[PDB]
Amino acid sequence: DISKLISRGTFDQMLKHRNDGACPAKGFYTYDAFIAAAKAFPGFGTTGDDATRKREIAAFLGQTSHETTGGWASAPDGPYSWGYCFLREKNPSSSYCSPSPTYPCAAGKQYYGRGPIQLSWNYNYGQCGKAIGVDLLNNPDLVATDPVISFKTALWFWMTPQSPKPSCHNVITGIWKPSAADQSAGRVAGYGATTNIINGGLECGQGWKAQVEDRIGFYKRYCDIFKVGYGNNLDCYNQRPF
Amino acid sequence: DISKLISRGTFDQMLKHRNDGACPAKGFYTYDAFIAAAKAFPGFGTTGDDATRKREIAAFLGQTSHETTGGWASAPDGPYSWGYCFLREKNPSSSYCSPSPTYPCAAGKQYYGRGPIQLSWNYNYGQCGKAIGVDLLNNPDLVATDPVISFKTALWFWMTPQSPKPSCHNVITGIWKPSAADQSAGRVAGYGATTNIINGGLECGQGWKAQVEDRIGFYKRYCDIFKVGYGNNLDCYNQRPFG
Ligand SMILES: [Cl-]
Ligand SMILES: [Cl-]
Same domain, yes or no: B136 and B74? no
Q: How far is the CA of A162 from the centre of ligand 1 (A)?
A: 15
Dihedral of CA A215/B125/A114/B108: which sign? negative
Cite the DSSP H helix spans in A16-121. Answer: 31-39, 50-67
Residue type, position B59, single letter? A
Ligand nearest to the CA of A178: 1
For A236, B7, B109, the CA distances from A61, given in Å and listed in that order, are 18, 47, 29
Is residue B38 a contact partner of residue B155, using CB atoms and an 8 Å limit? yes
How many structural domains is chain B composed of?
A: 2
Q: Which residues does A221 contact at the CB level (< 8 Å), separation at least 6?
A: A14, A62, A78, A80, A81
Contacts by A24-27, CB closer than 8 A, 24 or more apart? A24/A85, A24/A86, A24/A87, A24/A88, A24/B72, A25/A68, A25/A84, A25/A85, A25/A86, A25/A87
Alpha-carbon span B243 to B240, nearest angstrom: 9
A62: helix, strand or coil? helix
Query: First and final CA of chain B: distance in angstroms?
Result: 34
Alpha-carbon span B185 to B192, nearest angstrom: 13
For A105, A220, B32, the CA distances from B43, given in Å and listed in that order, are 43, 53, 19
Alpha-carbon span A185 to B155, nearest angstrom: 44
Same domain, yes or no: B168 and B54? yes
Same domain, yes or no: A43 and A82? yes
Alpha-carbon span A4 to A215, nearest angstrom: 25
- Radius of gyration (C-alpha) of chain A in whole angstroms: 17
Alpha-carbon span A205 to A193, nearest angstrom: 11
Q: Is B233 inside any structural domain?
A: no
Interface check for A208 against chain B (CB to CB < 8 A): the answer is: no
In the residue annotation, A89 being an active-site residue is answered as no
> Which of A18, A93, A117 would you mutate first to test chain B, the one with the most B CBs within 10 A?
A93
Q: Which residues does B75 contact at the CB level (< 8 Å), separation at least 6?
A: A22, B17, B81, B82
- Would you call B89 and A94 a contact, using CB atoms and an 8 Å cutoff? no
Same domain, yes or no: B120 and B81? no
Alpha-carbon span A210 to B92, nearest angstrom: 13
Q: Is B207 inside any structural domain?
A: yes
Comparing C-alpha atoms, which of A219, A195, A37, A25 is closest to residue A128? A37
> Which of A17, A77, A91 would you mutate first to test chain B, the one with the most B CBs within 10 A?
A91
- Resolution as reported, in Å: 1.6
Same domain, yes or no: A37 and A113? no
B114: helix, strand or coil? strand
Interface check for A52 against chain B (CB to CB < 8 A): the answer is: no
**Biggest alpha carbon distance in chain B?**
49
Same domain, yes or no: B31 and B65? yes
A81: helix, strand or coil? helix
Cite the DSSP H helix spans in chain A. Answer: 8-14, 31-39, 50-67, 122-132, 142-145, 147-159, 168-172, 180-184, 191-203, 210-226
Method for structure elucidation = X-ray
Q: Is A149 inside any structural domain?
A: no
Q: How far is the CA of B193 from the centre of ligand 2 (A)?
A: 13
Same domain, yes or no: B79 and B95? no
Cite the DSSP H helix spans in chain B. Answer: 8-14, 31-38, 50-67, 122-132, 142-145, 147-159, 168-173, 180-184, 191-203, 210-226
B72: nearest CA partner in chain A: A22
Alpha-carbon span B193 to B49, nearest angstrom: 20
Q: What backbone torsions phi and psi does residue A125 show, to the nearest 5 degrees?
A: -60, -40
DSSP letter at A151 equals H
Interface check for A211 against chain B (CB to CB < 8 A): the answer is: yes
DSSP letter at B6 equals S
For A84, A153, A207, B56, the CA distances from A194, given in Å and listed in that order, are 18, 16, 16, 47
Is residue B233 a contact partner of residue B174, using CB atoms and an 8 Å limit? no
Same domain, yes or no: A41 and A55? yes
A176: helix, strand or coil? coil
Find chain A residues with C-beta within 8 A of B118's C-beta.
91, 93
Residue type, position A157, single letter? F
- Radius of gyration (C-alpha) of chain B in whole angstroms: 17
B111: nearest CA partner in chain A: A202
Q: Which residues of A1-32 are buried (b: 16+ CB within 10 A; e: fewer)?
A: ebeebbeeebbeebbebbbbebbbbbebbbbe
Domain that holds residue B178: 2-86+161-226
Q: How far is the CA of B191 from the centre of ligand 2 (A)?
A: 19
Same domain, yes or no: B97 and B198? no
Same domain, yes or no: B73 and B123? no
Catalytic residue among A56, A67, A89, A203: A67
DSSP letter at A79 equals G
Alpha-carbon span A94 to B213, nearest angstrom: 19
Q: How far is the CA of B211 from the centre of ligand 2 (A)?
A: 22
Dihedral of CA A103/A105/A111/A114: which sign? negative
Same domain, yes or no: B170 and B221? yes
Same domain, yes or no: A68 and A119? no
DSSP letter at B121 equals S
CA distance A118 to chain B (A): 9
Alpha-carbon span B11 to B35, nearest angstrom: 10
Q: Which residues of B are catalytic?
A: 67
Q: How far is the CA of B166 from the centre of ligand 2 (A)?
A: 14
Alpha-carbon span B24 to B36, nearest angstrom: 23
Q: Is B36 inside any structural domain?
A: yes
Interface check for B63 against chain A (CB to CB < 8 A): the answer is: no
Contacts by A103-109, CB closer than 8 A, 24 or more apart? A104/A137, A106/A137, A106/A138, A106/A140, A108/B206, A109/A137, A109/A138, A109/A140
DSSP letters for B17-73: TTTSTT-TTTTT--HHHHHHHHTTSTTTTTSSSHHHHHHHHHHHHHHHHHHT----T
- CATH number of the domain bearing residue B221: 1.10.530.10
